[PDB]
Design a protein around this ligand. Sequence first.
Ligand SMILES: CCOC(=O)c1ccc(OCCC2CCN(c3ccc(C)nn3)CC2)cc1
Ligand SMILES: CCOC(=O)c1ccc(OCCC2CCN(c3ccc(C)nn3)CC2)cc1
Ligand SMILES: *C(=O)CCCCCCCCCCCCC
Ligand SMILES: *C(=O)CCCCCCCCCCCCC
Lengths: 279, 279, 4, 4, 117, 135, 266, 266, 62, 62
Amino acid sequence: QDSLPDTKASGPAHSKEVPALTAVETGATNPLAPSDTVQTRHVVQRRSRSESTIESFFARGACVAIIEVDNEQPTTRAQKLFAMWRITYKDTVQLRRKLEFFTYSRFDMEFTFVVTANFTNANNGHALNQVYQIMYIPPGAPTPKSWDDYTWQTSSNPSIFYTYGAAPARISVPYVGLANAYSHFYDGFAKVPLKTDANDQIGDSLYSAMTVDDFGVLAVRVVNDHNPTKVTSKVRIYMKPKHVRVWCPRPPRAVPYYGPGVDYRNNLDPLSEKGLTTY
Amino acid sequence: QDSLPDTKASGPAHSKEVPALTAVETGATNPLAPSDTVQTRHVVQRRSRSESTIESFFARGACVAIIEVDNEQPTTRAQKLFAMWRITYKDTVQLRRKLEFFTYSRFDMEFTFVVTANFTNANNGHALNQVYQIMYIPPGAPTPKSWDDYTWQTSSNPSIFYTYGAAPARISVPYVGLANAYSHFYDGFAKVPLKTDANDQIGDSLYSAMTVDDFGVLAVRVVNDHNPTKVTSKVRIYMKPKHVRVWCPRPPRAVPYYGPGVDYRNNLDPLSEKGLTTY
Amino acid sequence: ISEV
Amino acid sequence: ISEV
Amino acid sequence: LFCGSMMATGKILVAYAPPGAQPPTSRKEAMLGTHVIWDLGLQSSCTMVVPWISNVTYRQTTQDSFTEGGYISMFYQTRIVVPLSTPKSMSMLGFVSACNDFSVRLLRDTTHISQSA
Amino acid sequence: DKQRYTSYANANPGERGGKFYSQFNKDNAVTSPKREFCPVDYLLGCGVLLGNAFVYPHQIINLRTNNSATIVLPYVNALAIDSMVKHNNWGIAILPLSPLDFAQDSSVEIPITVTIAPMCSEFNGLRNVTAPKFQ
Amino acid sequence: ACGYSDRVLQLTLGNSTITTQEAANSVVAYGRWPEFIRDDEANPVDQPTEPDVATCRFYTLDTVMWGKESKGWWWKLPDALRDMGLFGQNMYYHYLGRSGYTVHVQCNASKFHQGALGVFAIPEYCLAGDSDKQRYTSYANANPGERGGKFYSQFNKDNAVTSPKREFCPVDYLLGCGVLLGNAFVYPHQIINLRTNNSATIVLPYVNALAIDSMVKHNNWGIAILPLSPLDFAQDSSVEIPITVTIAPMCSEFNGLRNVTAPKFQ
Amino acid sequence: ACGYSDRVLQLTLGNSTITTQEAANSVVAYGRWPEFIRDDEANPVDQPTEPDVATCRFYTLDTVMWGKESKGWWWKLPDALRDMGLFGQNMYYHYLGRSGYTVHVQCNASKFHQGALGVFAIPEYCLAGDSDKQRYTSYANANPGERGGKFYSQFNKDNAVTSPKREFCPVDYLLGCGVLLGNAFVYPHQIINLRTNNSATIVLPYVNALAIDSMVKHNNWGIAILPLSPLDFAQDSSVEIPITVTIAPMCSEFNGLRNVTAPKFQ
Amino acid sequence: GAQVSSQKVGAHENSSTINYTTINYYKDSASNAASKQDYSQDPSKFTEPLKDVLIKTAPALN
Amino acid sequence: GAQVSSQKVGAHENSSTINYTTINYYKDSASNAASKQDYSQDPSKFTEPLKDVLIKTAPALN
Ligand SMILES: CCOC(=O)c1ccc(OCCC2CCN(c3ccc(C)nn3)CC2)cc1
Ligand SMILES: CCOC(=O)c1ccc(OCCC2CCN(c3ccc(C)nn3)CC2)cc1
Ligand SMILES: *C(=O)CCCCCCCCCCCCC
Ligand SMILES: *C(=O)CCCCCCCCCCCCC
């Protein structure tokens, strides 16, 4: 049973108990109910808070990235034959705001990949079905310079081999934090400037940033050799936190995000105009 | 065992019991049987009413919508790159008439989506397989203005990612009513005009209508970037009520429907011509 | 199990 | 099995 | 919360009218509904509970006359009285929170945050 | 032509009640619409056939049998309680299944009197009086 | 224990709550809390109406301003409440009605203000009139409703025989009724002494020579508020503070229902 | 019994004692009293230093003056205390250090003064910056020590690309961090309402995603004091009262001793 | 947690109670299929809403 | 190793505790679905962080 407290039949009052009065200076919120300030009937409560549990609130796959990758003839200039994405929930705003209702979090992460593709050019013949390779490159491991170089051999890095048309790719990731909890906010620095330093750049750092590569990257490529005609593709990444726990509540972001930290720039006017005595 | 009452061997009569006579003025229906007005034999009845249970009567997926959506080059004018549909059983007539045999209903709802597509133009090359995104936008949530805008990030709204060619998409929805039952008919208004009102539009409302957006919308888009050649598609929505309960019986609609309320316009002549003494 |  |  | 000086006194009527009638423009009309008469004193603050009185089992979070909640209004029951050498004008702060019977359902995306291309 | 356009004032005649009509005469003037109901008798004023209205709680005043009809009504609604000012729960329809006839006098006329009593009435959410505009 | 006080009260009736942080305990008139007519004291035989929370709640009357020249205010009950929501309706739709009441009188100021209000609850408060004419005060003038009436410092007789005002002439030190004000303390009372308390709370039973009577023909209680000691502040000769009267019906019951009584207050 | 009160407190830590005759009870942040790192939550293996009474005592920071134009003040912890006696020494001689705190904020005035201070204790108080540049605020500007920082009424962007100030721009109604001030009450807090109390006492546990961390690289708690209601007195338009912040370390423990850290605050 | 019940056999093969098995895979009951073992009730509330319900052999109006 | 539990039935078909079955296929617990049987707690640490928590009917400041 998970229903909320029943309402009590409460009656008339003439006493020296004054629950309606309090003092919010103390830091506390008055634990009042209708039966303290008005006559109430007995209501048997069936309503429950089941959808607002920390798990139910986050239990939904959110889009956090769109990785664009092409399969075309390797020419001699800047191309997208392979792509890399620093894993994060911050490129998007929606999940970012929900997780930021809290300072600390601990959870397992589910990743679901929706791959879509299309023809770029009106017509150079067609393409046989493409297989995609998503490789996780943890910090330290060699990053690919070429779409078919040796790093894609993937002997120890986790890789997904997705086939176009198949049900969207899906995997789970454990709680991989270097600490007892993921910090959604870090009031600090990774380096400190010492008086004895040679230049003042040695000890300089980005405020609120911790590790440089934080969790690593996802590298994406079409394993297929190029067709005559080009195929452009998009790997959409959906993120869902499961087996979730959260600490220290924070106010929701009220102005538009300006980068990874708490920085604001514009649209600092969130509230509407409404008259004091207007309903 | 669910068979109907057996027939009784009944015999000749000469009595002061007159079951054949009654008085329908009272409001009641005479509970008679063949054995009351004629000599009957003993029949052991095996027949049952299993198909006419409220569940069996509704246990069928009915087409309630056809959502047309295109995937083409985003040009600068009115297009169908994404579509929205206010969820309802009233765009269609068939299920609408069955559910309307009753005033109140309570059930869980199953939605099955049949997606079909085709080529519009004789030939501009072809298209790689399309993935469809059906997002439920509950009232209050932001409605998309663009086919690839931020609302489709879908962090908390339920979304379906369907792949063309796959078995039709299917999901279940709980009893989501704001009341203890869905009202198939509401003899009332959402607002009341008060004497003290400034204009007489303030308190004006649509008769028999309750909430403005009632249950929200389904937004549909092709997640694929546009091919050179255009692909038009149709998402057919099938609705089936399950775990069904119904209250207060109503007469079936006898004239063609004219909008969401009980309004009639034409073809008010439902009955055929047949002679009084003609078989 | 549960047999009816 | 394990029934709660 | 009365944030006036300690020498300032006053009595205030704060009210809630369940929906369906004219939204109150006068204390006389506001009197008639659910209300608290706050007296300013050592206990700096006063709580008014808006009791769940509704036709539907759950109201909606967006605006809609069919599931509307009613009206909140406040009036002087007497007036703010100060002595001399005392500021004649001061601030009142207001706070809101849900009681323990309160619940919410059908998770959705908020209109309060967005993103441009 | 307008759907669900009948005004609160016209939907609610109070004590005076409303009447049925024998056929659908459409309110034609788009400029200043009457915003009234057009209840056609054999369609029960609601798009279904009158012969089936007997699935609803009823009695028949057959003049050779009885002076009256007594129907007791529970509160029926999809909610335990609602706004009585915004919403009607029950409707009372009295249609002559068989026409009034007497001796040979072609303009016969007898009174029909409706007497109603509230039962188990309970009220919630008290505040100032609602003054609707019936104009 | 905890920290409770004689001066800090909460009155809760129906959907209405009053808080006072500076009261002077509370008076229960003649030691009797309001109650319903008992079967052995019953007289009309018809089943009564008991509207409970819809009529037994706190109605706040229009505020009066106390100033240096203020001589006094008076109201009659049930008259003061004749137009108060569902109470007034029940009162006028029935021949018979009884009621008890909680009277809560409000007057706040500052540690530097000064003055004392005498709040008096009187059974059968018969006032004196205008004229040479005895018992000539008209129903319309006897009953001011919510607006109440005022006291005067001396007897100025309504002189015009031709078109008489038919009003009351309530002289303050004679309690408007021929006796001396200093003795009004034999009646249920409290004092709003501005250095001591913001308010007065008198609870009233139904008092009458009958179990129930016509509320439209007869007032049971009268509320008299006379300044025993004048309003004074700093040195500002035209000081002025609000006095607010809030009243609640209690244990209200009605007998003899029929069509509504429409009195002529013109 | 005897006569004890919610408003009269004595805080005694080490050789320091604070008395308040007008407090508003006291807050224990998130319901957790400060404690030492348990063996089953331990991570550095070296024997810790626990200076007890020599570091866990009341350090009073430089006083700030609240006036009619005052927009707000903010400090970070341990930063505010980096130079406070033996605490600062222990903090800079060790790589690792944890600490809880008792924050005691002081603001007195008179029954005739008016105003309300919002005293806020925030976990991980990340502030917004100067520029177009993201996460560009320098260590030197992020950490004012005892001096603390101030809030502003609006976002005036540091415009000079050539020689950037690399400072914070904390806008008051956005809590200097992109959210609205009215919601800061979800954080551990008290209100200094001048008609009610001279002070606020918030006790703070060590809050962090680690059992222990670098105090020199990272602040755990931020103290934000924003006037919810402005200072006002009599009619004198340039009123001014002192706000004094007194902080004490609690359950301080240090790991990883080596040579002293000398940061560049220039 | 498997549910087992008897099918109502219509056309019997030349081979008696035959059973079928059901298992719910989802936590939310809305996700469940329809059990279709539905009980019935009297027409009475509709066919005879009378305060004095009378016996079919006695005069309807007495 | 099958896990069996009661569904919280919302809209009941005209047919009582209905169960659902769960089995984990993977060794790593991160691979598991969400149990969603989540217990709650007091607002207190947040709604009343006080050293002397007082009773709602007594004066807040004594
Ligand atoms: C400090 C703020 O950021 C976070 O809190 C936060 C951000 C991202 C998080 O995701 C976990 C990190 C990685 C670890 C492994 N990973 C993988 C692993 C294998 C594959 C095929 N694909 N992805 C991708 C995600 C977890 C937490
Ligand atoms: C008032 C008359 O209408 C009805 O009675 C009636 C009409 C429609 C009903 O459907 C339930 C409402 C919605 C709620 C959720 N919903 C969803 C939810 C998620 C997805 C992917 N797709 N659809 C779609 C249906 C239920 C009842
Ligand atoms: C009760 O159901 C215990 C017996 C389970 C037998 C094995 C069932 C195998 C399928 C398990 C389904 C899990 C679905 C989430
Ligand atoms: C406990 O689970 C014992 C009962 C198992 C019943 C049969 C389950 C059949 C499916 C086994 C799943 C194996 C997954 C790796």
